[PDB]
Amino acid sequence: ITGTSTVGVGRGVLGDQKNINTTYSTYYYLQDNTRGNGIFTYDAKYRTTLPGSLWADADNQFFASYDAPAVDAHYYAGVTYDYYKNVHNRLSYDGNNAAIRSSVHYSQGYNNAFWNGSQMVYGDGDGQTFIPLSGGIDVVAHELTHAVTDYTAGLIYQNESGAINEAISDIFGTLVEFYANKNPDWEIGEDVYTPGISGDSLRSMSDPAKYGDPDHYSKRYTGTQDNGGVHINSGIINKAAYLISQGGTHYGVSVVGIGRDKLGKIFYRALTQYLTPTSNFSQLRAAAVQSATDLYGSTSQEVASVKQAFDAVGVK
Ligand SMILES: O=C(O)C[C@H](NC(=O)OCc1ccccc1)C(=O)O
Ligand SMILES: [Ca+2]
Ligand SMILES: [Ca+2]
Ligand SMILES: [Ca+2]
Ligand SMILES: [Ca+2]
Ligand SMILES: [Zn+2]
Secondary structure, three states: OOOEEEEEEEEOOOOOEEEEEEEEEOEEEOEEOOOOOOEEEEEOOOOOOOOOEEOEEOOOEEOOHHHHHHHHHHHHHHHHHHHHHHHHOOOOOOOOOOOEEEEEEEOOOOOOEEEOOOOEEEEOOOOOOEOOHHHOHHHHHHHHHHHHHHHOOOOOOOHHHHHHHHHHHHHHHHHHHHHHOOOOOOEEOOOOEOOOOOOOOOEEOOOHHHHOOOOOHHHOOOOOOHHHHOOOOHHHHHHHHHHHHHOEEEOOEEEOOOOHHHHHHHHHHHHHHHOOOOOOHHHHHHHHHHHHHHHHOOOOHHHHHHHHHHHHOOOO
16 A cells, blocks of 8 residues: 555564564555565455455554464564575565565464465464464565575476475575574474474474484485475485585585575575476586585585585485
């Protein structure tokens, strides 16, 4: 809508207070005019019709329990936007400042979040497996990164291409979490997963096997579940990314870590320049190697660590 840009205040899913960019026109709306063509957050009102209604509030204060997932969806979409802009010189997911839209309160007891081709969507969870999923910064960035991938490499959502797609979303979700510096880690979804269990998460990048996911190519899932294991075989690539950044010795192969900024630059370049819709793990290795070469030179430590990391997870 047309209106006046202002700043509201509210509480997120985890009870933290934060300011949010809003728009005033009779009501205060969750519409952030300060980033690209705008960031818009909607209420799906426990239904499955999308997007639902643009979030409207009477007093620009968002402290109701019902407000919390909208606050976080709105705020963390903003943070993710800032990450891609400030760190990668990318303007929104399409690179031309496309409007970012999110709906919360999707369905009832819905233990999921997704990117539907046009917008982000967050369930409230059932209160046992998940609390509202927009409460996790890595979750929000993971979803927005699907949009980025769709508009760039266009990796199809099956088999190894699909698993790369997932890993890219896990990689950048994590890098956004570190960028915001709010209890950052190499785990996925820990902030909103299983409120009755501390210390766990949906996935681990540092040790995927912790939650049943493969950390080596030899252990890859070859069946037909999960579109050929896109959420499973992503562990192989996640582990590789972790190793590139942090270093370590994995199945006897040692890797010198080059840090997360360089990890981000190498993978962002691979994603936006060399990956294709049907790229497999081997092609990803080649793309990451070419990216690191482009950025740091053929004989660099960066290139050598990329190679070591893929070697470590058995990807040639
Ligand atoms: O497969 C899909 O498209 C939906 C799936 N969604 C999903 O797993 O929701 C929970 C969650 C999301 C990100 C990080 C941790 C937990 C996905 O985005 O991969
Ligand atoms: Ca209010
Ligand atoms: Ca964390
Ligand atoms: Ca995390
Ligand atoms: Ca938990
Ligand atoms: Zn995903």
